[PDB]
Give the backbone structure.
Amino acid sequence: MLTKFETKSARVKGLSFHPKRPWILTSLHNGVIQLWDYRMCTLIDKFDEHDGPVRGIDFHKQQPLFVSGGDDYKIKVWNYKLRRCLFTLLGHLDYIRTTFFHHEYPWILSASDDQTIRVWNWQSRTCVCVLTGHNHYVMCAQFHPSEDLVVSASLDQTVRVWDISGLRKKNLSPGAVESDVRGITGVDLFGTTDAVVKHVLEGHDRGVNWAAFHPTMPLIVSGADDRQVKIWRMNESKAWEVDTCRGHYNNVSCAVFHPRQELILSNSEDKSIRVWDMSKRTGVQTFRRDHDRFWVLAAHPNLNLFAAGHDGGMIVFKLERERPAYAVHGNMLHYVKDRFLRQLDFNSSKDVAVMQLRSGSKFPVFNMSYNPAENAVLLCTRASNLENSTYDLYTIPKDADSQNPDAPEGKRSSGLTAVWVARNRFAVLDRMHSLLIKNLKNEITKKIQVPNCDEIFYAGTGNLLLRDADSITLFDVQQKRTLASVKISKVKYVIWSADMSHVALLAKHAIVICNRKLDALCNIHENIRVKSGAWDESGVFIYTTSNHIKYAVTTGDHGIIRTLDLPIYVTRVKGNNVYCLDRECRPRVLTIDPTEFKFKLALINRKYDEVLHMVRNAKLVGQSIIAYLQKKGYPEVALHFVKDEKTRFSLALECGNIEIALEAAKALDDKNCWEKLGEVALLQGNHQIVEMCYQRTKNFDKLSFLYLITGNLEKLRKMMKIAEIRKDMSGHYQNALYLGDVSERVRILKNCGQKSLAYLSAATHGLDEEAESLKETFDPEKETIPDIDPNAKLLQPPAPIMPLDTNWPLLTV
Amino acid sequence: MDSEPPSEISLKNDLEKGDVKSKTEALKKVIIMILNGEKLPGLLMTIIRFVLPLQDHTIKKLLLVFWEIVPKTTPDGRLLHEMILVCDAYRKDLQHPNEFIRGSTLRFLCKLKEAELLEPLMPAIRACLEHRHSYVRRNAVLAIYTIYRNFEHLIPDAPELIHDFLVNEKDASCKRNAFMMLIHADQDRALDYLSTCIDQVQTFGDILQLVIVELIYKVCHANPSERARFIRCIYNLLQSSSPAVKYEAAGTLVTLSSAPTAIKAAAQCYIDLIIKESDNNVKLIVLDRLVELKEHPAHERVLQDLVMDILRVLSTPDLEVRKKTLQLALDLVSSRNVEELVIVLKKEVIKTNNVSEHEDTDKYRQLLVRTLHSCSVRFPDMAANVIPVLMEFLSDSNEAAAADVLEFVREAIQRFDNLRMLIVEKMLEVFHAIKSVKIYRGALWILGEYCSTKEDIQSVMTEVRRSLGEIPIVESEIKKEAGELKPEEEITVGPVQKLVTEMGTYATQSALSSSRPTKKEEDRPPLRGFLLDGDFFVAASLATTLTKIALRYVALVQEKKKQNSFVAEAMLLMATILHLGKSDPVYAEAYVHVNQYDIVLDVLVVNQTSDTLQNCTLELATLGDLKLVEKPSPLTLAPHDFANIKANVKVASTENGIIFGNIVYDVSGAASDRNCVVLSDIHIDIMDYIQPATCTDAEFRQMWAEFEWENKVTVNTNMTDLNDYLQHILKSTNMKCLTPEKALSGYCGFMAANLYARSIFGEDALANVSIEKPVHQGPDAAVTGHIRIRAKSQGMALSLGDKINLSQKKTSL
C-alpha cells in the first residue's frame, strides 16, 4: 500500500469518490466539506455548509457539480467551478447520512437518519418519490453504475434495495395479481411496511451502517455496528451466498469492495482498518494507522485508487502499478496490467479510453513478452520464482487464453517463465530457474522443453528473457550462455523498437536506440532523457518527452508532429501511426503526417517551388520556414525567405553584394547597418555605394580619408564641407592635403580659430597670402620654423587615374 | 473599508439614502477601493445624482476627487459628452462665491489631459482668476500650464482669459506670492519676469522660479531656495581637488548616514584629507589642498598634531571610526605607511610598559609582533627602532609572551643578517619558564643563528631541553636552527660544536648534550630530520649550511606585499579581509524564433478534428520565474483550423502560485469540464528559475568555508577549457565562470573557474570546474573535468553537476 494522499481535516463522516475524475469529497463533523484533486494536490473547494456534522457527501457529475447532505436536514448542491450554491432542497427532517444523485433528470436522493430515503425533483415543483421501509436509520445509500437501482444500508438490521424511478421498490407477481408484500406468514415472515417488495436483503449484524459494491459485480459487502462484515447478493436475496468476515473489534462503520484487488477492504470505529480475503471471507490482516476510528469508506467507481475516511482526516491510497512494460503491434497495444482493467487503442487528446481486444495480459503477469516477428505473446502465469508455473501464449492481433484448445495456437504448458527471443519464433525459458531453450519444432514455440541449463541469473520478465541479480541480462536463443549484460541509468523503463530482438536504453541525454546484444545504432537528439520513444524499426523515430509527440527525426527532417492534452509514453511505432499509453494507461494515437516532414524533405533536395505549397499553418512556426531559410553562406534557402528586414540584411553580406543590404539596412531604420554594409561594399570593390552609405551614417571624415585613396577629387571636396561644420579635424583637414593645393584647410581652420595651423598649411603650398590673412586676422608671427616646414613646397599631383575607384570595375557573380 | 473589492452593491444603497453623511461615506468608500485598484462603475448614476449643482462643498469635493483618478473608465452615469456629468453643473461649481468649491473644481478640471473635457477646462480658469489666497493664484498658474499641456500648445491656451490663460506665470513674479508653472514651453515674457522676481521673491515661489532659471551674479539675495542653488554655483567657481572644505553641502550630508558611527568615520576622513596633500604613496593618500591647515610648524600653538594623535587608534573611539582612523593616521604622515605604522604598532604591540596593550592570547600578540616587524622589512630605518621594542615585548616574561615575540624576530633576522646580533642575549632570558611550543621554537632559532655573538648557549638551552611544555613544532624549528654561525665562538660548558650535536639530536638523532633535548620526533609528517642532519657540512658556519639559510631570506622579502610582512597594523587588517567586495482536443507544434531581436515561442494550433472547439481562446501562462510578454491572441482552434499564433516569452519574473513545470500553454474551447486544457510546446527547464550572480575570489573563498562543496561528479565533455561548452551550458543553468582557484605550472594547470549564482530557490549555487587536461604523464582520467559543486543545501549543486556536459535543442518544421 502506498499513500498517494493524506490530508488531516478532522473527523470525516462521509467520503465519496468522483466517478468522472480521480477526485475525493469528504464531509466533516466540523461542518466543512472539501473537494480535493488528490492526484494533483489542489484544493478544488471547501464549504462550511452547516454548523455541526455533515455526514453525507456525493458527486453529482452529470453536469459538473457536487452534492452534499448535512444535518441541516437538507440536500444541497454545489458548484465546484464557480463556488456558489446551485440549489437547495429539503431532504428530510433528520441527519442526512449519505446522499446519492440520479442521472435521470437533476433529481437528488438523500438517505437520512429519520428512517426514509427520498428522491426530490428540482427541475419541476414535484417531489417525485419517497422510498420507505426502515424502522431505524438509513445510514447509507449507494449507487451501482446503473442508475435504476440503489442499495441502502440501515440499522434496523436490513439492506433494502430500491428503485428511484419507482415509488418505493418495483415488482409484480406474474403468477398472481396480488402485491408481493405479505404482512402474514407465507413462505417468509415480515410485516406490511412496503408498497411491494423487489428485494429485501439481510443486513443482520445489529444493523448495517454502510453497503457498497465491487464495480463489475452485483455482490455487496456491508459493515455494521458489531464487529463483523457480511457479504450479500443484492440480486437475489440469497442466504446461501452470505459469508461473514470476522476480524474487527468494535462497530464496523463500513465495508466496501476494493475494485482493483480480490480482497474486500473494511474499516471500523475501533482504531483499525482491516483487510479481508474475498475468496475466503475472513481476515487476512489488520492494519492500525492510529488516526483512531473510521466512520466512512469509499471504493472508486472510476477504478483509480481506494480511500477510507478516519477521525483525523482521510487517506487515498494506492495499490496500483507504475511504468508497465508494453509493445505495440499494428493497431494493438499490449501492456502489463494496470487499474481500470484492460483498455487501449483509439483517441488522440482525450483522457477517455475505449476497449479493443489486444490483451497481452489476461492473467497475473509473471512475464508479458512479444514474439520478435510480432505474431505471439507470451504471458507467464501462476506467479512464482521457484521452478515452475504455467505459461499461456496468445495470438497477437486478438488475444484469448486459448484460441481453440483443438488448435496449436493459444496452447499452454509449464515453465516458470518463458520469454520470446530472436530467430523470430523462438523462446527461451526457465523451468528449473536456469536458462533452458524452447522449441516446439516449427511456428511460434509453445511447448516446454527441459534440456540446456545454466547456473547464472534468475527468472523474471523481459522480451529477450530479462533476468537480474545485479544487471539486466539478455540471454541467448539456443545457448545457456549470457548473450550480453547491460548496465546503465534508467527512468524506470525498457524500450523496444517493436520487434523484440532490439532494445532502446535510456542514457544521460535522451535515449539510445540499439540492436540485439548492446550495440548503439544512434542517439536521439534532445537535451533531457525522454520518457519513452520508439523507432518505427529504424528511421522515423517518434517520441514523447512532455505532453507532445514529436519526431526526433524522419529523413533528416525535424518536427514536432502534434501535442496531446495529457503526459504520455509512446507504446511504440509499428506502422505510420505511433501509439501511446500513460501510467493510468489511457491511449493516444497519432498519424505521422506529411506536414513538417514533407517541407524539409523538399528543402534538403533543394526545392523551393515544392516547399511553397508545403508552407501551411500547422508547421509555419517562425524559423523553419520564414527565417530558417536565411541560413546559407552562398544564399539558396536565403533567397527564398527574405521577408524580414533583418533576413534581407543578412542575405546581402552572405552574397557580398550589399545593394540589397542598404535597403534592408534602411528598412531596419538604422545607421549601423549602413556603415557595416558600406564597409562590405568597399570589400566588393566600388566606392560609389560606400559613399552613399557612409554619408548617411555621417562618416564624412572616413570618406574624406577614403577619397584620394579612391582617386576622386570632386567627391573628396563634398566631404570636406560637411565635416568642416563638425570640426572633425581628421575629416575636413584631410582633403586639402589630398588635392594639390591646400586652401580647403585654411578656411576650415580659420573657422576653428586655428590660425597657426591654417597659416602653416597654406604657407607651405606657397599660399603665403592666405597664410598671412590668417595671421593678420588673428595673432601674427609667421616667421618661426617648426619641427615641420612652414613654407616648403606642398604640391602633390592629385590622382593620375582618370577613372576612379568609385568606378572600380566589377562584374559580380 | 481598507480594501474590500466586493462591496459595490452596498455602496449603491449607501450612496443615496436621504442622509448626507451616508452619501459622503459611500462616495469615500468608492475612492478608497479605486485607489487600491478595485471595482467602481456599477454605482455611477447614484453617485452623480445628489451632488451635481450644489455649492455644498464636501460632496462636491468628493465627487471632484473621483474625477482625476478614474473619470474616463466609469461610464454608467456619465457616458461620453463634451459637458459630461464631471462638468456641466460644475460650471456652477466654478462660478460659486465660495472660493473652495470653485477652486477645487478648477483644479481637477484643468488637471486632466482629457479631450472630452478640454472645452470645459478652458474657461475653468475663471474660478481662480480672482485670487483669494496664495493657493488660488498658485492653483491658477498650475492649471493654465496643465491646460497648455492638454492639447493647447497654440492659441487655446497662451494669452489671458480675463487675467490668466498662461499669464498667471507673468503675474505671479510681480504679485505678492510666486509660483511659476512655466518650467518648460511657456511664455518668454514670464521667464524674463521671473528673473526680475529673484529680487522681489516669495520663498516657495523662489524654488519654482529657480528650477526654471538658475545662476546668480551675486552672493545670494536671501531665502533657503537661493541658498541651495548657490552651493551648486560655488562648486563651479572652484571645482579643483574636490570641494575640499565642504560648502553648504555639510547640512544635508550628516543625515545621509544617520546610523551613527559612520558619519564620524566619514567626517574624520574629510578632516584628514583637508589637513594636507602629502606624497600619496601606499596609504599616504591625503588629497584636497596642500596648505589650508598645514602640517607642522614649531611655533604653532597648541599644534596640528593633537588632532593627528586621534587618528592613531587602538580603538579609542569605536570600531567603525577606528578602522577609518588607523588608515587616516597612515594617510597624513608617513614615509609611505611604514613610518606611522611603526609608531602606531609600537602602541598596539605587546609590552611590559603598559598592560593595556599586552594580552595572554597568543595569536593576536604574535600578529602584533609581525606587524611591527614588517615595517623594518619594508623600510630600513624601522629595523633599528623595531629590535629594541621587540626586546621590551619579550620582557613580559610569560612563556607565551616571550614566545610570540621570539617567533617574528627570528624571521626578521633571516631578512636582517648579522644586524640583530645584539638581540640574542635579551631573547634567551625568557625561554626557561615555558609551557608552549612557540617559545622554544623562536628562542632556539635566535640563540642558534646568533651563536658567534654570545657564548651562553649550553646554559640557556639546557634548562629548556630538560623542561617540558608542548614540543611538536619545536623540533622543526630547532632542527634547521641550533648550530649556526661561526664554528667555535661559544662555550659555557658546550661550545658551538656541542650545539651542532644537540641540533642533530633534537632533529631526529640521539646524543648527550644540553642534558638531552625535550623531544626528537619532528612536527608534521613531511618535514623530518634528515635534510639538516646531512647538512652542517661545515660545522655551524656561514658557508653553505643552516647558517646560510638562517642568514638569508626565502625569495623576495620587501615592502608590505606580505613577503616577510603583514600588511599594515594587525587590527585594521581584519576588517579589510572581511570585505569581500562582492559585485477539448488540441494539437500544438512549436519552435522558438528570433527576428529583429524579438524572442518568441512560435506555436501553431491545430484542430485535426471535425468536432466543434469554438469558444477557442489561447493563453501563455506565468508559472514562476517564466512569463508571457504577450500570450498568443487569436481566437483560433476552430473545426479544421491550422493557425500560426505567436506567444512572446520572458525568462525572468516573480513566482506565481500555479505549477512550476516546463512551460504551461493553455488553449480553451468547447467543453464544460475541461473548458481549459494544458498542452505543451517544446522544453524549458527548472534551471531558468535560478538567478545568475557572480563572485570574486574572496566571496567564493568565504562561501567555500561557509558551507561544504565536497560533492563532486566528473562530467564528460569538460575536455574543453572553462571558456567554451562549459561557460555556455553553465550560463543556461544561470551560472557564470568567474575567478580562478588554480596554481598552474609544468605539473599543475587544471583550469579552475569559481562559480556563483544566487538562485531563486533559497539557495546560492557555487562550483569549481576543474578541467583535468593533461599537464602530467599521469592525468586523472585524461581530458574531462571534475566539477566540485555546492549550493547552500546542495539542492542546486546537482544542476551545476550535470548542466556542464551537453545541451542542445533544434527542430525544422
